[PDB]
Design a protein around this ligand. Structure first.
Ligand SMILES: *C(=C)C1=C(C)[C@@H](Cc2[nH]c(/C=C3N=C(/C=C4\NC(=O)[C@H](C)[C@H]4[C@@H](*)C)C(C)=C\3CCC(=O)O)c(CCC(=O)O)c2C)NC1=O
Ligand SMILES: *C(=C)C1=C(C)[C@@H](Cc2[nH]c(/C=C3N=C(/C=C4\NC(=O)[C@H](C)[C@H]4[C@@H](*)C)C(C)=C\3CCC(=O)O)c(CCC(=O)O)c2C)NC1=O
Ligand SMILES: *C(=C)C1=C(C)[C@@H](Cc2[nH]c(/C=C3N=C(/C=C4\NC(=O)[C@H](C)[C@H]4[C@@H](*)C)C(C)=C\3CCC(=O)O)c(CCC(=O)O)c2C)NC1=O
Ligand SMILES: *C(=C)C1=C(C)[C@@H](Cc2[nH]c(/C=C3N=C(/C=C4\NC(=O)[C@H](C)[C@H]4[C@@H](*)C)C(C)=C\3CCC(=O)O)c(CCC(=O)O)c2C)NC1=O
Ligand SMILES: *[C@@H](C)[C@H]1/C(=C/C2=NC(=C\c3[nH]c(C[C@H]4NC(=O)C(C=C)=C4C)c(C)c3CCC(=O)O)/C(CCC(=O)O)=C2C)NC(=O)[C@@H]1C
Ligand SMILES: *[C@@H](C)[C@H]1/C(=C/C2=NC(=C\c3[nH]c(C[C@H]4NC(=O)C(C=C)=C4C)c(C)c3CCC(=O)O)/C(CCC(=O)O)=C2C)NC(=O)[C@@H]1C
Ligand SMILES: *[C@@H](C)[C@H]1/C(=C/C2=NC(=C\c3[nH]c(C[C@H]4NC(=O)C(C=C)=C4C)c(C)c3CCC(=O)O)/C(CCC(=O)O)=C2C)NC(=O)[C@@H]1C
Ligand SMILES: *[C@@H](C)[C@H]1/C(=C/C2=NC(=C\c3[nH]c(C[C@H]4NC(=O)C(C=C)=C4C)c(C)c3CCC(=O)O)/C(CCC(=O)O)=C2C)NC(=O)[C@@H]1C
Ligand SMILES: *[C@H](C)[C@H]1/C(=C/C2=NC(=C\c3[nH]c(C[C@H]4NC(=O)C(C=C)=C4C)c(C)c3CCC(=O)O)/C(CCC(=O)O)=C2C)NC(=O)[C@@H]1C
Ligand SMILES: *[C@H](C)[C@H]1/C(=C/C2=NC(=C\c3[nH]c(C[C@H]4NC(=O)C(C=C)=C4C)c(C)c3CCC(=O)O)/C(CCC(=O)O)=C2C)NC(=O)[C@@H]1C
Ligand SMILES: *[C@H](C)[C@H]1/C(=C/C2=NC(=C\c3[nH]c(C[C@H]4NC(=O)C(C=C)=C4C)c(C)c3CCC(=O)O)/C(CCC(=O)O)=C2C)NC(=O)[C@@H]1C
Ligand SMILES: *[C@H](C)[C@H]1/C(=C/C2=NC(=C\c3[nH]c(C[C@H]4NC(=O)C(C=C)=C4C)c(C)c3CCC(=O)O)/C(CCC(=O)O)=C2C)NC(=O)[C@@H]1C
Ligand SMILES: *[C@H](C)[C@H]1/C(=C/C2=NC(=C\c3[nH]c(C[C@H]4NC(=O)C(C=C)=C4C)c(C)c3CCC(=O)O)/C(CCC(=O)O)=C2C)NC(=O)[C@@H]1C
Ligand SMILES: *[C@H](C)[C@H]1/C(=C/C2=NC(=C\c3[nH]c(C[C@H]4NC(=O)C(C=C)=C4C)c(C)c3CCC(=O)O)/C(CCC(=O)O)=C2C)NC(=O)[C@@H]1C
Lengths: 164, 184, 164, 184, 164, 184, 164, 184
């Protein structure tokens, strides 16, 4: 699963090398940057329900047609699952903040997402809008430090990019 | 492979929950500089550790370098030195990452069966690993002795604390013990 | 040439990836660690002749037989190349300190060194002794900061290990 | 590949000398966080940049999406979108490294020739790259206009300085210009 | 293991061929050349201890520093192993003379030798000197026939080259 | 693979001892020209031997070419002819080398199991090998009968001695017998 | 082209080896056996027309049907080419005798022969009978020495086996 | 590849005629033992030859081992030492076979073009080959000087004749001359 340390270990292993100067350096970066992304991970851990709720609310208000008969937000089950999905993405983002690399998002969210929503006739735009809302929503210093917000937004953009 | 942080995320995902207990991980960060020194301490001394551990394994068991011994002839001695370096390298990965999964997945898995097919003797393999375990502990504590090192003694010059990174020493030893268990 | 940034770029490119979270974190480590290794790289650039001179002297003091007729330090030309060689290694170490990766040492010193020395009948023990002396020589804060000395010493040990 | 520091090293080795002038390198480190923000600014908006740039190239030349056009049929449109992203990806690598070599060796070398054999129109390619260059500049400055972005406007929220990273803007632009030069 | 006959068998098998004209001719070579190399093999068999002892003595005579503290001929265990190593090579040469190919020396002596000596910090010059002494030592017909001596010297030069 | 001489060396290396007994090997050389003739006698007549052996296996067990038979259809008959020649070829290797290892390593190891998976009757295979054993003996002795040869009779013209290479015949036979042992 | 020396050279080159003891030994074999096979080669060189005429005569006597209308020996062009073919094989055997390997026969006679005769509806039995005649025809010491006849017959059987 | 004998065969096949004059070829056999000594002389001293010749090329041209030099840094020197041995190896092949074809086919063909692309200096390559040609001649004659050899002098101990195998010396030098011609 991709992070600062797994990447350099994997590179070192491919050449049969002990960890060397650049590997140790790279990990120092994880030490330095950890404060900002763990701040974001902690804010998200504590408030994930409300954060996911308003992102979900945003995509439904952008696409009211989803509530129509036969559409992806039209039943109590569909509604629950849509909100659940948004929360899944936020949770994987929380994970990617903790780990400091896109691994959790890559492996448990992005991989296969396009086949799944195609097979199920789920449009991708509401997913994009939910994430896009969440990306535009935060401001610093209100919600978290400016650098924590940068970490948070970067993962949101990463997710958005994967659907775009 | 996992690291200390993705390991925690895997455990959280088992109940599809956010990672909330960040105590052990903020601690992992707090001891990050220590961990880099410990890895620097092994990597910097790795050639000397491997040759000394294999030499040690042999001086305790002369069977290895006599007829039918598994460090005979030159080809076998060379393969053995190689393996000792490989095992130590994967242990240093584990220590850098803070998680045994790279060692388990890329080195230990299937190794016992490989050794059994070749007739590589477990008793001696374990002994080489044992010596490397003791070497690593001393280099991480930065207390290697002139007695074992002679002219090749190295001092790391890292910032000293009273415990001398006892936690990292124990963790390092746990990875070596995983090798031993895997070969057992 | 292996460094913090080329390692993560190579890894990203292999996977068709834009720079992401763990790539930027890695480069932050190079920012943080650079003060220590550039301190050493400066201390070395400004005194390499003297540092290489006493290292060379040490390997000859250790192995007087090199002075005997037909041995690798017996002629004036031979003496000059051995010292030149000791200075080569220190200069590649200086490069490696600047870069923050073993790339320069790897490509321009270590690659092919075994084949060269075995071809010419050049014993490797005096190479190792000269580097070993340099590795044991330094102390902090006298010569440089403890962290700069750490960077210096790690590359010396990296070179020693390539010969051992 | 090389980076800004290995580039200086390569030039220093040309005269078998140490790297003494650490002037531009201290400055490189000093602008490190900026550089990271600049890369983040492009990477984070990459999909929007590529679709907008290719759309821009097409709205300026409708021949591209008519019969015989190089963005017709679907397969060709897809190939073109892919190529734009590839080029932008290597430009971000060059920016992260502070050196063009990765862009030259892995992307641009031989590209003119590849395109000429395929019949990929150089003039339209240049235009796509020109638009991406203008996008990158604005995102690095964190001054994208609502006029060009519409509902998809993104603000980076990096710490503001008066020249808004003029140095880094010129550098990114220089990498785009290398692409256009190589395809000219 | 490489001999005259295993070489032609291996080539025939790669092409799916029965032994043919050139294969039988090759083996006729073995028949003719066997007397000389087996003569050397018998002399070596009967006198390997004395041959090895004096070749070992010569390399220590060339490099007295090896007796110094911390050097490779400095203890009793070290002295006994060095002589033993010299005897190993002569025995492998004895084997190669019997087989009539470099097989035994390739597989059990040369393969891995560079890695072993590097690891243990054992200089290669004394090996070369011990083998070089043995190479220059023999004369015919005192020690064996001229053609037997040619076969003997050829395997010593083969080993010397593998270390050079 | 090993030959007669490297076989002696491997046995000597097992006790890290010089090869002292070179009598059996001096006799190998002394009978070298004979050995070359014996290999020539099989190789030269291999095609006749293989076809006559498989034809004899078949004429003794017609089930092999009737419905469901393992030499039916053409593809299976051809595969069988191929196999008989392969076995004969590796036997001639063994005879030229004065050691079975090339036969064991590259032909017989895993063969019984291969035939089991396939349903190739080892018993009929044994019979074809038996016939080839008998053929080889007579060609080595240079005493093939006209009864078994017809218009395909070949005479080798080797220098005759009373025992007619009794030891080599026995050795050749032992190799065929190894095949038969391996398939039983 | 396969001979004693090109076989061992090919093998050495595959392993990046200088010529070693078993290579030289193999070549001593060709030296030893050369007298026998060159005796055959000279006999065949000086009498190839007669050797081939009687072998061609033999196969046609064996197979009178070939003279019948539409068969392979029925016209003057056909009769000419058949004799020519027998002579081709005898010349490649002569070549192989000089070389001491089957190379010439392999490359210029056997390779492609089956495809050619299949395409042209040429039966192989007449080829085999012509060669079989030649194989049984000679006797030592009348035609050449016993060992020279062995060398001759061996290449004939080789050619016979390639068609059988 | 061809040898002395198959070369003659190839020339005969051109006029589809038998090989009639075995004069040069009976001569080849007669000198066969000399040829084997000559190949032994070169193979047995190959390491000394290669190192002495590359070091000679270098001591005559210091530019090779200074910045920009083609034997700088360690990697290039190693590549050069390798190439010198490769060329010597293929020359010994040609000498053993008595035909240049293995040298031409497997080594020389395409080599001038490869070095041109690499910037491997032909003038230095030629000198290294020149010294090896000089070495081979002395070794084949068994007359190396202590001057050029020092402590590494080797005498082959072959049966001496007046011309000291003048024919083979000329043949050997003609192979070295082919290499030089191929590059120049
Ligand atoms: C054979 C007679 C024989 C040996 C060889 C030797 C093997 C051995 N070594 C140790 C312990 C260590 N070896 C170390 C290695 C080094 N120290 C250095 O400073 C350099 C860089 C490097 C290479 C020489 C180290 C650090 C140790 C740790 C202990 C210490 O430093 O005192 C052991 C002991 C194993 C244990 O303690 O469980 C053995 C057996 N001993 C032999 O008998
Ligand atoms: C066809 C009708 C047509 C177009 C399509 C469009 C193409 C075009 N776009 C630009 C300039 C920019 N585009 C930008 C893209 C984005 N901004 C964002 O905030 C999101 C993340 C992203 C996707 C929409 C940006 C940042 C710019 C820079 C200018 C700005 O004001 O922001 C151009 C101008 C390029 C140039 O100067 O040469 C063009 C032509 N225009 C069309 O006519
Ligand atoms: C089916 C009815 C049937 C057969 C076909 C035949 C098979 C068979 N053959 C032998 C013995 C030999 N065959 C030989 C072959 C040849 N001799 C030659 O000269 C040419 C080159 C070659 C091809 C024809 C040889 C040499 C022998 C040895 C005996 C001999 O007298 O020559 C056997 C007997 C095998 C045994 O003894 O177990 C059999 C069964 N027989 C059939 O019934
Ligand atoms: C640099 C200052 C410098 C050199 C290095 C050296 C290079 C050189 N060597 C020769 C000639 C020979 N070298 C030989 C090699 C050997 N002889 C041996 O006995 C051992 C086994 C082996 C390695 C030492 C041989 C045999 C020769 C042939 C001449 C002779 O033996 O006397 C030359 C001369 C090449 C020529 O004639 O063009 C050179 C330049 N010389 C240096 O100046
Ligand atoms: C147990 C392993 C050691 C020990 C280690 C300690 N190191 C401490 C601080 C420290 N170490 C480094 C170097 C490290 N950081 C990097 O970025 C890199 C490479 C890129 C490396 C090798 C730094 C920069 C620091 C902080 C500065 C300083 O303290 O000088 C340390 C103190 C902090 C802590 O308590 O964790 C310790 C204890 N100390 C020991 O006693 C044993 C021998
Ligand atoms: C031009 C690109 C921009 C701009 C950039 C600036 N960024 C500045 C500081 C800064 N940026 C970061 C984030 C960066 N560092 C990282 O480690 C990572 C990811 C791992 C990223 C994305 C940090 C941590 C900092 C330092 C703390 C801070 O300043 O808040 C910055 C100020 C420093 C300087 O002057 O170089 C600038 C100017 N500013 C602009 O106006 C345009 C839009
Ligand atoms: C049982 C196998 C035979 C038989 C064999 C004998 N052959 C004898 C001598 C001999 N054979 C060859 C040919 C061989 N040597 C080669 O170099 C090559 C091809 C490269 C071949 C095929 C030669 C040259 C010689 C020596 C000359 C001669 O003696 O005529 C031989 C006599 C020596 C001995 O007793 O070992 C025997 C017995 N003879 C038999 O009785 C059966 C049929
Ligand atoms: C120029 C090359 C030399 C030289 C060579 C001569 N060698 C002569 C004879 C000879 N050499 C060998 C060894 C060779 N034959 C082998 O089978 C093998 C390995 C398999 C090798 C290395 C033998 C067996 C013989 C024949 C026996 C003998 O003469 O002792 C030789 C004399 C024969 C002839 O004149 O052609 C010569 C001249 N002699 C020289 O003067 C330079 C140094
Ligand atoms: C900067 C002043 C912005 C701005 C910010 C406002 N946000 C408001 C409410 C709000 N925001 C979030 C998302 C935030 N909470 C989190 O836990 C995380 C990340 C983990 C983020 C990004 C939530 C869940 C809420 C509701 C709960 C709360 O009050 O914090 C807000 C209140 C009014 C409103 O709801 O719109 C403001 C003013 N608003 C702006 O206009 C500037 C640009
Ligand atoms: C620390 C208390 C040590 C110790 C240190 C001493 N070093 C002395 C001289 C010296 N050291 C160096 C190497 C140093 N110079 C460099 O430029 C670099 C790295 C680039 C290093 C590591 C040099 C070149 C010199 C001579 C010039 C000078 O004095 O600075 C020294 C003076 C006496 C002496 O030469 O030994 C001391 C005391 N000595 C110790 O015993 C502790 C362990
Ligand atoms: C030719 C006359 C030489 C020469 C030869 C001398 N050798 C002497 C002693 C000696 N040589 C060996 C090696 C030899 N014995 C073997 O078993 C084998 C190979 C299996 C070889 C090559 C040994 C072991 C010994 C000591 C026992 C013995 O005497 O045989 C010798 C006696 C005096 C001395 O030790 O030097 C001589 C004269 N000496 C020459 O000057 C020419 C060139
Ligand atoms: C003939 C005496 C038998 C007989 C033989 C059949 N064998 C069939 C397939 C087969 N045979 C082998 C072994 C062969 N290949 C090798 O590489 C080696 C040694 C290196 C040997 C001995 C293999 C591996 C295979 C399977 C792959 C293949 O078809 O080549 C076969 C065809 C089986 C089928 O397709 O049903 C037959 C008929 N059958 C007989 O009745 C007599 C006793
Ligand atoms: C004689 C025993 C045959 C027979 C033979 C005929 N062969 C005919 C054509 C032909 N033959 C060969 C093989 C020959 N050419 C070579 O180059 C070599 C080896 C170097 C050999 C052995 C070839 C390639 C060809 C086709 C090209 C050509 O016309 O030469 C032939 C003419 C048949 C036709 O034109 O359809 C005949 C009659 N005829 C016999 O009766 C017995 C079976
Ligand atoms: C030494 C006498 C020269 C010299 C040689 C260099 N050659 C370099 C690279 C190189 N050489 C070859 C040819 C070699 N490889 C083969 O496979 C064969 C024949 C079978 C031969 C003769 C190749 C193909 C290559 C490229 C691949 C590689 O590096 O192995 C080289 C390195 C050049 C570079 O990478 O910059 C050198 C230095 N150079 C000299 O200065 C003297 C004249």
């Amino acid at each position: 699963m991709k992070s600062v340390v797994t990447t350099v270990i994997a590179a070192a292993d491919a050449a049969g090398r002990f960890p060397s100067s650049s590997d140790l350096e790279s990990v120092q970066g994880s030490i330095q940057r950890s404060a900002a992304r763990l701040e974001a991970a902690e804010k998200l851990a504590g408030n994930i329900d409300a954060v996911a709720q308003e992102a979900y609310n945003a995509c439904i208000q952008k696409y009211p047609y989803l509530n129509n008969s036969g559409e992806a937000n039209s039943t109590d089950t569909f509604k629950a699952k849509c909100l659940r999905d948004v929360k899944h993405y936020m949770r994987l983002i929380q994970y990617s903040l903790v780990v400091g690399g896109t691994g959790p998002l890559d492996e448990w969210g992005i991989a296969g997402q396009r086949e799944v929503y195609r097979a199920l006739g789920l449009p991708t735009a509401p997913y994009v809008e939910a994430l896009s809302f969440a990306r535009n929503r935060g401001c610093a210093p209100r919600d978290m430090s400016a650098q924590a917000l940068t970490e948070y937004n970067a993962l949101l953009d990463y997710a958005i990019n994967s659907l775009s | 492979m996992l690291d200390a942080f993705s390991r925690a995320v895997v455990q959280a995902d088992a109940s599809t929950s956010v990672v909330a207990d960040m105590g052990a991980l903020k601690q992992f960060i707090a001891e990050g500089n220590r961990r880099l020194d410990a890895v620097n301490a092994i990597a910097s001394n790795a050639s000397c550790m491997v040759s000394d551990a294999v030499a040690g394994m042999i001086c305790e068991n002369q069977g290895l370098i006599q007829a039918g011994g598994n460090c005979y002839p030159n080809r076998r001695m060379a393969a053995c030195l190689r393996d000792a370096e490989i095992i130590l390298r994967y242990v240093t990965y584990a220590l850098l990452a803070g998680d045994a999964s790279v060692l388990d997945d890329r080195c230990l898995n299937g190794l016992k069966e490989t050794y059994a097919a070749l007739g590589v003797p477990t008793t001696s393999t374990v002994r080489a690993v044992q010596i490397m375990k003791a070497q690593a502990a001393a280099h991480i504590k930065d207390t290697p002795s002139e007695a074992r090192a002679g002219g090749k003694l190295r001092k790391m010059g890292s910032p000293v604390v009273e415990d001398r990174c006892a936690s990292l020493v124990a963790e390092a030893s746990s990875y070596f013990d995983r090798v031993i268990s895997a070969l057992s």
